[PDB]
Amino acid sequence: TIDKINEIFKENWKNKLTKYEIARIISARALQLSMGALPLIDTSNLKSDDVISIAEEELKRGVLPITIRRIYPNGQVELISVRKI
Amino acid sequence: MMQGTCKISSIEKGALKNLYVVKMDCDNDLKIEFDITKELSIFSKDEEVTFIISREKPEYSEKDFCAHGYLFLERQQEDGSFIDEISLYGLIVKILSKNGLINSKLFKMMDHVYYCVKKKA
Amino acid sequence: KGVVGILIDQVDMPYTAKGIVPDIILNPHALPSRMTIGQIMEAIGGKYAALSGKPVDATPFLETPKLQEMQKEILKLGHLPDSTEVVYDGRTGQKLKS
Amino acid sequence: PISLIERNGLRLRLVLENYPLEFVNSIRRASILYVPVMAVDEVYFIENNSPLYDEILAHRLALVPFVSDEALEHYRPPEEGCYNRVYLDVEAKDQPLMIYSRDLKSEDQMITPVSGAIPIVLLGSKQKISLEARLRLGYGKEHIKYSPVSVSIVRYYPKVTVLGNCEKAVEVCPEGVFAMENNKLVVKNELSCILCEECLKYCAGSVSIESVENKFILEIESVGSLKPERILIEASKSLLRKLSELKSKLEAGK
Amino acid sequence: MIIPIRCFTCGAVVADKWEPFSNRVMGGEDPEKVLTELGVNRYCCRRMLLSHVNIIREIIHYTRPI
Amino acid sequence: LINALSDLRIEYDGTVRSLYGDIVQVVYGDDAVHPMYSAHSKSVNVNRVIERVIGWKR
Amino acid sequence: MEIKVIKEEQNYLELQIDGEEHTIGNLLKGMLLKVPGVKFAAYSLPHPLITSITIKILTDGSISAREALIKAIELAENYANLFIDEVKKI
Amino acid sequence: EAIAEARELMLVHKNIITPRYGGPIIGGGQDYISGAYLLSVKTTLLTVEEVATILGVTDFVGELGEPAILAPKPYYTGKQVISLFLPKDFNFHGPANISKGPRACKDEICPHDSFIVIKNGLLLEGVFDKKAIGNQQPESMLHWSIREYGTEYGKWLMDNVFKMFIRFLEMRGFTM
Numbered sequence: 001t002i003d004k005i006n007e008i009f010k011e012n013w014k015n016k017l018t019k020y021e022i023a024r025i026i027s028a029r030a031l032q033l034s035m036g037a038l039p040l041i042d043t044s045n046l047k048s049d050d051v052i053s054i055a056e057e058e059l060k061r062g063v064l065p066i067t068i069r070r071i072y073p074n075g076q077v078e079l080i081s082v083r084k085i
Numbered sequence: 086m087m088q089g090t091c092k093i094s095s096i097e098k099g100a101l102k103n104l105y106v107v108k109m110d111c112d113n114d115l116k117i118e119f120d121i122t123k124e125l126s127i128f129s130k131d132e133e134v135t136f137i138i139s140r141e142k143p144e145y146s147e148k149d150f151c152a153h154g155y156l157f158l159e160r161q162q163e164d165g166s167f168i169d170e171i172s173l174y175g176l177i178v179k180i181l182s183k184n185g186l187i188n189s190k191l192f193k194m195m196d197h198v199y200y201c202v203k204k205k206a
Numbered sequence: 207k208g209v210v211g212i213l214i215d216q217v218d219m220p221y222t223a224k225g226i227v228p229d230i231i232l233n234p235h236a237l238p239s240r241m242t243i244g245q246i247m248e249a250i251g252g253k254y255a256a257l258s259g260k261p262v263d264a265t266p267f268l269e270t271p272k273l274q275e276m277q278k279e280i281l282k283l284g285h286l287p288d289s290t291e292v293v294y295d296g297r298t299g300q301k302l303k304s
Numbered sequence: 305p306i307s308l309i310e311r312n313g314l315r316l317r318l319v320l321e322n323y324p325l326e327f328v329n330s331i332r333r334a335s336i337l338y339v340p341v342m343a344v345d346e347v348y349f350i351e352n353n354s355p356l357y358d359e360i361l362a363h364r365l366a367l368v369p370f371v372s373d374e375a376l377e378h379y380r381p382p383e384e385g386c387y388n389r390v391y392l393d394v395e396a397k398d399q400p401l402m403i404y405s406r407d408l409k410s411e412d413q414m415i416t417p418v419s420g421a422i423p424i425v426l427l428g429s430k431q432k433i434s435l436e437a438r439l440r441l442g443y444g445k446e447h448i449k450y451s452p453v454s455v456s457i458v459r460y461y462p463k464v465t466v467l468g469n470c471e472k473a474v475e476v477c478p479e480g481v482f483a484m485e486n487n488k489l490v491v492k493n494e495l496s497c498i499l500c501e502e503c504l505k506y507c508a509g510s511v512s513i514e515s516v517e518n519k520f521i522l523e524i525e526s527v528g529s530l531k532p533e534r535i536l537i538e539a540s541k542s543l544l545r546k547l548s549e550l551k552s553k554l555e556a557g558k
Numbered sequence: 559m560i561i562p563i564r565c566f567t568c569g570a571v572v573a574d575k576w577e578p579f580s581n582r583v584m585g586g587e588d589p590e591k592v593l594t595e596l597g598v599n600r601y602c603c604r605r606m607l608l609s610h611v612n613i614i615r616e617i618i619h620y621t622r623p624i
Numbered sequence: 625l626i627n628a629l630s631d632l633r634i635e636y637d638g639t640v641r642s643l644y645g646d647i648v649q650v651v652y653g654d655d656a657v658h659p660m661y662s663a664h665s666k667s668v669n670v671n672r673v674i675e676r677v678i679g680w681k682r
Numbered sequence: 683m684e685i686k687v688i689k690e691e692q693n694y695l696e697l698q699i700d701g702e703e704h705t706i707g708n709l710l711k712g713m714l715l716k717v718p719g720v721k722f723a724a725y726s727l728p729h730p731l732i733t734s735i736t737i738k739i740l741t742d743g744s745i746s747a748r749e750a751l752i753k754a755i756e757l758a759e760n761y762a763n764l765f766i767d768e769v770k771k772i
Numbered sequence: 773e774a775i776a777e778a779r780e781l782m783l784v785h786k787n788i789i790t791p792r793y794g795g796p797i798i799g800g801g802q803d804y805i806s807g808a809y810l811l812s813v814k815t816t817l818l819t820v821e822e823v824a825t826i827l828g829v830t831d832f833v834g835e836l837g838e839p840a841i842l843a844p845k846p847y848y849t850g851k852q853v854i855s856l857f858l859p860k861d862f863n864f865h866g867p868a869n870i871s872k873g874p875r876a877c878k879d880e881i882c883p884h885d886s887f888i889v890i891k892n893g894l895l896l897e898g899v900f901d902k903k904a905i906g907n908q909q910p911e912s913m914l915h916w917s918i919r920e921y922g923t924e925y926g927k928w929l930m931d932n933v934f935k936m937f938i939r940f941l942e943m944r945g946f947t948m
């Protein structure tokens with residue numbers, strides 16, 4: 001209840017994912033796939049063999065299990081899942 | 086819809102370099118000012134022609150003028166007459182008449198419609 | 207000043223009715239902001255010099271001949287007075303509208 | 305239909321009556337590009353004291369055109385191994401000597417430079433030059449030294465009509481399409497029009513200019529390597545070869 | 559330096575026309591008529607013949623021994 | 625300017641506090657709207673929305 | 683000349699030809715516009731530095747796009763043969 | 773990780789709108805504006821062959837549709853050619869850059885096509901200029917289209933439509 005705009009901001013960013021978090025997820029998944037992690041999506045029927053593209057498609061589908069924990073400045077921590085079952 | 090015999094008054098030099106405005110007096114106090122280009126100049130002054138504005142595609146000949154466009158800009162003048170502008174994908178046809186097109190429920194706004202003016206012979 | 211954007215073959219370049227293709231093509235938009243009228247004047251003067259064969263003197267404040275006589279002589283030799291000329295597109299073969 | 309206008313030395317002007325503009329443009333482009341002409345490919349320099357460096361001299365020799373009307377059938381095209389040889393071995397004595405293309409001895413007697421007045425290089429005192437050039441057939445697509453035509457033009461067919469007598473039109477038009485005889489404005493060279501529309505611009509009502517849709521004017525100027533008619537025939541043959549190969553590949557793909 | 563074999567714009571041989579054009583222009587004839595009757599009508603070739611320097615005449619004195 | 629302003633960051637509550645913890649603004653730009661995503665200087669151009677909805681029959 | 687086929691269908695075809703400049707592409711575009719049934723035919727030079735063209739054909743469905751291209755090639759061959767015959771007698 | 777961060781954050785199309793002000797930093801240069809204007813003039817008319825040559829450069833395959841002029845001669849208007857690329861729900865009513873002086877009537881009734889009228893993705897009126905597709909121009913038609921349909925659509929529109937503009941200026945003739 002700091003201000004009305006602060007409340008709007010906080011309720012807006014609960015259900016959405018910022019581009020920094022998307023970039024971090026994609027980079028982490030690409031690094032994992034490069035070392036030898038097995039992709040979750042179907043390897044075949046993909047036009048691009050690049051690891052970055054596979055990680056991006058996995059993020060778009062939502063198969064990869066990643067939970068982002070965002071620490072608010074007042075100590076509150078929010079967990080956002082990417083599974084989207 | 087909205088077809089009638091008419092006589093063209095003059096062919097103005099036009100605002101642009103290669104555009105001529107054809108002015109036309111029709112029945113029931115209706116006037117039509119439509120833009121043409123040098124190639125689309127099959128018209129001569131004081132000639133009597135017939136125009137049709139129909140949703141369905143009408144018959145036309147090589148000696149006729151046929152086009153299709155989207156009706157828009159329904160406005161009511163302070164006098165009381167209604168002004169409409171049909172855009173033949175850029176070529177403006179300006180209709181001044183009482184009981185305008187959309188007011189009289191003849192056409193809907195933003196509807197594809199063919200405008201065909203044909204010489205009488 | 208400017209780098210070479212691309213090298214274009216003789217077939218692709220837009221040829222004129224006499225078949226003369228440009229050696230260098232320059233964007234007209236470079237002219238009005240830079241306000242270099244001397245470039246167009248030199249183009250017309252060079253065309254007149256090649257056609258008539260007579261020397262062209264472009265010394266500032268005193269040029270021989272003047273622009274009007276150069277244009278008249280260019281018209282006399284067989285080209286357009288304003289140094290323009292009919293150009294056909296090399297790739298498609300279609301005459302340009304201007 | 306094809307109608308000849310004027311057949312000057314190394315120049316040919318034709319009117320094509322029923323041909324699309326795309327085909328005529330392809331003909332002119334293939335005449336510039338897809339017609340093989342013999343020209344210098346490599347140069348072997350035994351000795352060179354000339355002011356011109358080796359690369360400049362090799363380029364000058366390459367730009368020299370050789371007559372190759374009878375060399376098309378006797379020599380393999382580059383897509384196929386048979387190259388002609390030309391020798392140049394001279395030396396000045398005490399005064400500068402401008403050596404021309406006439407003193408270009410060739411292994412094959414039928415293949416000679418187009419003109420002997422072409423100056424290759426100028427040699428100073430006591431300067432010796434000796435080289436052997438290996439001539440090879442090639443298309444204008446690979447290099448411009450192989451182009452058989454100096455210029456090729458395809459332009460619209462003009463239809464110019466005089467409507468009344470106007471004194472200005474004779475001096476407005478850059479071409480001699482208009483003449484003033486017996487105080488009457490007439491057209492002398494209708495086909496010399498270029499559709500400039502100055503004739504229409506200064507006297508709009510006196511003259512009417514239009515273009516004929518089906519007819520076109522095709523002009524080619526050779527450099528002496530080939531006859532203009534042979535250039536056109538070879539361009540059409542190259543177009544036929546390309547179209548036939550494309551059709552074969554399309555049929556194979558199907 | 560030395561006149562180019564072919565016109566840069568159109569591949570037309572102008573090297574063989576240097577000697578007649580230069581000799582007749584130096585003789586006292588206006589370049590326009592000489593060019594017209596020599597066989598060059600396109601001004602692209604005329605600028606090739608008109609604007610030439612013939613540096614090669616001076617260079618033969620200062621030639622690299624090699 | 626870059627050396628002075630480098631430490632600022634946007635946090636999850638809308639504040640513009642620096643990395644050392646010092647708060648600069650309670651809300652960024654008074655509406656938490658980035659200039660990149662704003663329609664010129666406006667967070668929402670209402671007339672633009674009106675156009676988007678009823679422009680065909682305008 | 684290499685040939686590659688893209689997005690081939692009954693009425694829509696794309697085809698990349700390697701080794702032909704504007705001349706063959708424009709010739710084929712003209713003949714495709716001449717043959718009946720072709721709704722929209724156009725060639726393109728994706729990059730002038732690379733001598734490879736791409737021809738896109740969309741047909742009304744009466745005739746196949748590949749068949750339309752073959753008919754255009756036949757028309758071009760007929761024109762070339764007629765031109766040769768007419769030049770030889772000149 | 774560096775490659776992934778470069779792709780997901782610093783890609784060119786994602787940064788079309790500058791952070792300095794809410795306006796597109798990428799847009800039509802000087803030549804693109806002239807080509808778009810000359811293509812969008814009310815007087816332009818294009819035959820089927822010219823339309824095919826214009827649209828060849830773009831990566832657009834589809835039904836051209838009936839030409840805007842059916843008789844006496846089939847002619848496609850430049851606005852009709854342009855409207856094939858606009859999204860089917862896009863409304864704009866801004867003035868053009870040419871309506872910056874005496875010739876401006878400040879209304880959609882001016883005989884001079886200086887008032888851009890687009891309804892349901894159809895360029896019914898007006899011409900494209902610096903105020904329609906120009907760079908560094910906030911609240912322009914291009915800026916609104918990008919803001920409403922994403923930077924990927926923005927990039928697609930830029931590539932195809934601007935190549936079309938350049939091709940038309942090539943085949944018409946622009947000189948000094």
Ligand code: F3S
Nearest residue numbers: 477479497501502503
């Ligand atoms: S040369 Fe010919 S056709 Fe027209 S304007 Fe000039 S006359």
Ligand SMILES: [Zn+2]
Nearest residue numbers: 565568602603
């Ligand atoms: Zn020349």
Ligand SMILES: [Zn+2]
Nearest residue numbers: 875876882884
């Ligand atoms: Zn106005």
